[PDB]
Design a protein around this ligand. Structure first.
Ligand code: 9ON
Ligand code: 9ON
Lengths: 291, 290
């Protein structure tokens, strides 16, 4: 299983992910253009390089954890020629399904194996190695990748061909967004009807409406003391991050001509909420329903 | 032996009253439809020509009626015929406003009263697995418990009068939103080239999981028992979901609440019910391009 891994993107996700790879005994060759990110990763054993091409030159596997499809595209353009032939590229960035398929084809045109493997779990999942990887690409390529993913992962799920990882994540998170708004509406309506928060909680969680947005992320303080509502709506899952994912869902809706009325409505709601509350947990959208 | 007047012997009322007979109660009935009455009499209910007659000898009076207006008119018709401290249980699904009005009216005559609307449908009614969501006094629920038990899989005290109705309407508004949201996810997935089984496996193991997908999956295959595999036979009909959402919209209006997605869901299902009232509510997956 021991492998030389180039890790491009050493931010809030990339840094802890890379540390777990070092802990598992891999040689990790890192690059990030932010020197503070690079320094922090070096402190936990990443060999940091001056450029992304240098980092990938001697690597069996190249992982990208980057903010957008544009940055992934630009990164692949900078490094693919530098990589040894038939190197495994894993993009664990969260990007559009369109961009994922573009960068996948580019990697394959350079003779590289490529997977999309975006993750859920956030920074906390990243530190604890409990992230869920949602993978698109060839099954044999995933087989080759498993030893590298396992030390970062709680779950690895194969979603289909290239882009299917991005697709699965973005579909789930659109539903989540809609559910978190709907649970918030339910709690505020209950409050105006004189139905207690604890009572509504007990019913919804015992009934057909139950979902993570209530049972774990309860947007009123009290029924779930661990939920962000009890900690000033500190993330958790920030509004900024949810808004990014909803943007990607709206990109997917636009590329496909799909009709997603509530998903699109939830996107508009989170886009407005992100303008001034980007730093709050996405459950804090409940504030928009009170007045 | 507690004697129970059951007013409303329709699709729900008939099987509920059969379970009460089966539990050893004396059941007195009224319904304006001769077929409903006859069918109930056939399983042991002593049917009377008028609601006031049914109520005369009753320790408990149960209503299962279509609207608040009918519930209200039934109460003013029968309250004077009832014995003092009779226990009235309305298991109709009506507005929280109407529920609290009829509760107040009944207690004004020295009656004890609960709202106890139900989830489970006709299937649940027959099988005695209904979920009663109850508003009223804890001590009144305790007295009612022996009567509710033979009809029920769950009995949940929701709070003071009207809280049963509120709890049910709030859950069903969330459910409608979830059922549409899951449908959108499956349609988007298909157009992205992500298989239904793959999306199913991901969502059910992730934060988006809910009954609308894990049990009511609106595409055939991943859950062989879901209505999608059986021509969208209810299940839970669009007609009934539409009725609940209408009540949610009455509650949103009465309170001045902000419920944008619930309201959007209500609009979608009202429109869908014009064409497909008889299909399971999960069938909404095929009306999104309208
Ligand atoms: C074994 C596991 C990866 C290892 C971990 O739990 O960190 C998996 O996702 O299959
Ligand atoms: C609903 C009740 C069970 C009564 C019964 O159905 O026999 C309970 O479990 O609380």
């Amino acid at each position: 299983m021991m492998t030389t891994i180039a890790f491009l993107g050493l931010g809030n996700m990339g840094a802890p992910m890379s540390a777990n790879l070092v802990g598992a005994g891999h040689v990790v060759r890192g690059f990030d253009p932010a020197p503070t990110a690079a320094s922090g990763a070096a402190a936990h054993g990443v060999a940091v390089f001056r450029s992304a091409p240098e980092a990938v030159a001697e690597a069996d596997v190249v992982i990208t954890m980057l903010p957008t499809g544009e940055v992934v595209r630009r990164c692949y353009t900078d490094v693919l020629a530098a990589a040894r032939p038939a190197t495994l590229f894993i993009d664990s960035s969260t990007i559009s399904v369109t961009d994922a398929r573009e960068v996948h084809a580019l990697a394959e045109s350079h003779g590289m194996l490529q997977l999309d493997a975006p993750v859920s779990g956030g920074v906390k999942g990243a530190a604890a190695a409990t992230l869920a990887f949602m993978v698109g690409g060839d099954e044999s390529t995933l087989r080759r990748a498993r030893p590298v993913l396992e030390p970062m992962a709680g779950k690895i799920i194969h979603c289909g061909a290239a882009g299917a990882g991005q697709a699965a994540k973005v579909c789930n998170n659109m539903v989540l967004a809609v559910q978190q708004i709907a649970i918030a509406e339910a709690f505020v309506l209950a409050e105006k009807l004189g139905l207690s928060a604890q009572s509504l909680f007990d019913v919804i969680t015992g009934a057909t409406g139950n979902c993570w947005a209530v049972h774990t992320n309860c947007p009123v303080p009290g029924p779930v003391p661990t939920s962000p509502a009890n900690n000033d709506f500190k993330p958790g899952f920030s509004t900024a991050l949810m808004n990014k994912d909803l943007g990607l869902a709206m990109d997917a809706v636009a590329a496909t001509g799909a009709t997603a009325p509530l998903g699109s409505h939830a996107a508009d709601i989170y886009a407005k909420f992100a303008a001034d509350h980007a730093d709050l947990d996405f459950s804090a959208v409940i504030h928009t329903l009170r007045a």
